[PDB]
Amino acid sequence: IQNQLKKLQSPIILLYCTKEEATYIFEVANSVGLTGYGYTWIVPSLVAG
Amino acid sequence: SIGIAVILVGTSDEVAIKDAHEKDDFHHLSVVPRVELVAMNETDPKSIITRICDLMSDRKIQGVVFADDTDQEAIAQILDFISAQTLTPILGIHGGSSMIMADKDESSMFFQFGPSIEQQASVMLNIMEEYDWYIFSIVTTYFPGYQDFVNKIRSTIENSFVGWELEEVLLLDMSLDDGDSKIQNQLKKLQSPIILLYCTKEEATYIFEVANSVGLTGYGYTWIVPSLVAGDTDTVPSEFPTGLISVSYDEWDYGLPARVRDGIAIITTAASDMLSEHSFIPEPKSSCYNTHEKRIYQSNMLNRYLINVTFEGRDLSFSEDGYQMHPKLVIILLNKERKWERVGKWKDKSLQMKYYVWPDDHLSIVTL
Amino acid sequence: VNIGAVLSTRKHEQMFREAVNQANKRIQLQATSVTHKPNAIQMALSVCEDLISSQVYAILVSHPPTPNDHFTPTPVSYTAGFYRIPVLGLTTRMSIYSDKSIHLSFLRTVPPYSHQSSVWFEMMRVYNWNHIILLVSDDHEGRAAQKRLETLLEERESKNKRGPKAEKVLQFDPGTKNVTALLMEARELEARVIILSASEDDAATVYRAAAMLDMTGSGYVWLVGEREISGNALRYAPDGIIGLQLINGKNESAHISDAVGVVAQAVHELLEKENITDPPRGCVGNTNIWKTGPLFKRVLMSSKYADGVTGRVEFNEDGDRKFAQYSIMNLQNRKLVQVGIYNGTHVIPNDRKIIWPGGETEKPRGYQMSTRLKIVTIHQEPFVYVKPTMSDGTCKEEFTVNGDPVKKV
Amino acid sequence: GTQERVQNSNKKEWNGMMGELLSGQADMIVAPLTINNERAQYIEFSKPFKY
Ligand SMILES: *[C@@H]1O[C@H](CO)[C@@H](O)[C@H](O)[C@H]1NC(C)=O
Ligand SMILES: *[C@@H]1O[C@H](CO)[C@@H](O)[C@H](O)[C@H]1NC(C)=O
Ligand SMILES: *[C@@H]1O[C@H](CO)[C@@H](O)[C@H](O)[C@H]1NC(C)=O
Q: C386 at the D interface (CB within 8 A)?
């Protein structure tokens, strides 16, 4: 994932998952650079409520 | 009569001396180089100095041709200091890195063999063209040629009569990547089929390893690196995929005997040119511990002769660096056998190949 | 351990011996010593014969009685470097060693000459100036100073007056005598401040030439380095010049002591490190490395020996005295008006009679512009016509279709 | 004037008018001088005066 999640270039991402692996990917995102710099994130309330 | 001392380390090519001495041009031997050999066991810089001035005092040696053998050679500076002591010239005929480094000083007369960074880069581009590669990128960190190398190659790009491509120069940090994730991410931005790399030998394997991850492997890519991360030492770490190409004919099959030949040639010819200008300087220094300016009267202007010299049907010219202006280089390739096979021969701004090729999405089309 | 040094003062032997004795309160730290020798060959050989053979730890050396002696460090410098033995320097300021590449073995106690020009990036912040010229030699020294100024002239990214901007910087080779061609050149320029960085004698040459060109009158400024206040130039420089002195530079013993203290802090940081490998092989086992030199420098990194005689002495990223204050000064009729007001990048508020060369007291903006304007222009038909004059010297006078005088020049 | 490498080294200078504009020989060019990109790198341009 550290390599695959580089191929993003859009300002908007949508994610669908569990709740735990959610934190896991959030963490790897803290690495790949996809963070609150100028990006945004929306997820349909069924990883977190 | 003249004192021309020589020296080696770690070899026994004894007759490689007297033989090449018998093959001396009668028009150039007018100073009759009294060749003399010694073989230290490559032990002590101090020993080097001892022996140097020992023979200097012994035979009024007006010049030496040193020879090296270890890959571990940062030691030119020593001889340069000797030039700073004695006003005699010195030839780093061969060895490890014993003809490469950029030891730059004014009152010195040490001269390496092999090519510079630049002429290497040039032959690199040459072979890059003759096989219709057209897109590439670069990767390096902190070596005296970095802002030199990039500027050199890009300044020949900028006169593009042909199509080229410069994607990016990848500046990195040597021996500081605490977090190797940085490279794991940064080395994704490659997209060209051709990459050029400049580094040490160890971090080389390190990056090869990270490349084994990022995907840059022997699938359809290729890699070329200028023989100064790896040489005829042929200790290939696993991380090298076959297909590495480079050019390292600095001392590959040039012939250490022929090497000493060329050495004696250029030096005694320069002596001929100086006595031809009525400027024979047959006065060596007096003593090592006593090589002071008391004996040092006039500087070594015979550099005005050392720069360029042709004999035995071969020409050797020199730049301020001190490499040969017209080297004879060869291009070799990393085969699957982790063996180095010679492929091409470069000389005189020209190439010689044997392949036309470099081994289902590849097709054969016809036309009219 | 055994640390040695090749230092000029014989008494300095006992000096830093006592320095060891004082540092002992924070573990054997035996002392080793050795005098000098002219031809640095014998120096390096003594290096191996005694101190390398001792084969323990690092080493020091200062300037010999030789004034310039720009070469005296080098041999013994990279001699031990051949085994990556980190060595510190005392009193030499030539900038070559500033390179890590050909010397990965060398730290210092003192800033280099070419480093000093950094301070000049500030003298306008009290004398609001923006326009400068340069006069550097042709060697590395000048090139160094130049790159340093260039990067110090980093354009402050904006979003009125925006920084100072350099002008045509000039060069010159040593020993010359007709340098005047340059100055008269500059004479026509549009500024009035100057900066000059060179050797001793060359400066005096320039002084001669400039005083001849009267380029040292009123409305002029000068800011030379250290190598010019020196007497050989003090026999030629005009008054009102400004110069500067590194404080406590030419004093060995105090620096000696600071050095001993810093290396003492270092070794106390050494007495508890891990993987302690072995000092070199007596200049005979010449293949190996006391594979701690890297870590030795890295621990010498933050050896925050907070205070000595010169006070706090901390390092750059090139192992050099990084924040050493020093003094400004003025020539005032062969007299030395001292204004010791530069404590590092702190501003410099002294109190005395600044006198500029013209004898005024104003701090003139070295600016003047409304001159001739050497205009160029290419031949091209319906915009500029070229015509030969008459034998008189001017060209014939014509008239328009109505008959007006077609101005010509 | 155009921007050409010379010396067979890594430097590129201008022959031509702009050369004598940058090296100090002159200090204003008045002629039929075009506008461009590169030229606008190292020189400033008054507003045009004949489109
Ligand atoms: C070496 O260069 C110089 C410069 O002209 C001159 O001696 C000659 O061209 C070259 N040497 C020979 C032997 O031709
Ligand atoms: C040489 O120097 C003198 C003064 O030292 C100066 O007048 C002259 O213009 C210089 N050049 C020549 C060619 O004489
Ligand atoms: C140099 O250091 C010594 C230390 O003994 C000190 O007494 C002296 O004032 C300092 N300055 C000079 C110029 O000696």
A: no
In whole angstroms, what is the distance from residue B110 CA to residue B92 CA?
7
3-state SS string for C322-376: CCCCEEEEEEECCEEEEEEEECCCCCCCCCCCCCCCCCCCCCCCCECCCCCCCCE
Chain A interface disruption, residue of B181, B184, B185, most A CBs within 10 A: B185
User: Given its phi and psi angles, is residue C282 left (phi above 0), alpha (psi -120 to 50 degrees) or beta?
Assistant: left
Q: Tell me which DSSP letter residue C246 carries.
A: E
Whole-Å CA distances, C70 to C58, C63, C148: 22, 9, 21
Residues of D in contact with C182 (CB under 8 A): none
Q: DSSP 3-state assignment of C299?
A: helix
Task: State the residue for tokens 């270039």.
Answer: A9
Which amino acid is residue C199, in one-letter code?
S
DSSP three-state, residue C230:
coil
Residue type, B269: T
For the residues of C45-106, what is the DSSP string, one character each?
HHIIIIIIHH-SS-EEE---SSSS-TTSSHHHHHHHHTTT--EEE-S---SGGG-SSS-TTE
**Residues of chain B with C-beta less than 8 angstroms from the C-beta of D5:** 155, 158-159
Residues 7-26 of D with CB under 8 A from B: 10
CA distances (Å), origin C210, targets B232, C196, C206, C235: 60, 12, 6, 14
Take residue D44 and report the two structure tokens written for it.
């400033």
> How many Å apart are CA B334 and CA B243, to the nearest integer?
5
Whole-number Cα distances in Å, B329 to B123, B149, B341:
9, 19, 14
Binding-site members of D for glycine are: 32, 34, 39
Tell me which H or E stretch contains B65: strand B61-66
Distance CA D18, CA D43 (A): 9
Residues B90, B309: Cα–Cα separation, whole Å: 15
Residue D47, CA distances (Å) to B72, C143, C160, D30 in order: 64, 38, 21, 13
In this structure, the number of other CB atoms found within 10 A of the CB of residue C366 comes to 20
Experimentally determined by: cryo-EM
8-state DSSP, A35? S
**CA gap C257, C278 in Å, rounded:** 27
Report the interhelical angle of B76-85 vs C74-81 (nearest 10°): 160
Are B228 and B336 in contact by the 8 Å Cβ rule? The answer is no
Comparing CA positions, the residue from C70, C34, C74, C38 lying closest to residue C53 is: C34
Is the C-alpha dihedral spanning B73, B74, B79, B83 positive or negative? positive
**What is the distance of C-alpha B334 from the center of its chain?**
20
CA distances from C258 to B87, C3, C32, C63, C108 (A): 40, 15, 17, 16, 12
* Residue C328: closest CA among C224, C234, C243: C243
Distance C176 CA to ligand 2 centre (A): 11
B56 phi, psi to nearest 5 deg: -55, -50
Within 10 A of D50 (CB to CB), how many other CB atoms are there?
Answer: 5
The span from the CA of B156 to the CA of B211, in Å, is 28
Q: Give the whole-angstrom CA distance, residue C346 versus residue B363.
A: 72
Beta bridge partners of C107: C88
Between the CA of residue C315 and those of B115, C103, C116, D12, what are the distances in Å?
Answer: 38, 17, 15, 39
Cite the beta strand spans of C171-306 per DSSP E.
196-197, 242-246
Neighbours of B6 (CB within 10 A): 22
CB C137 within 8 A of CB C172: yes
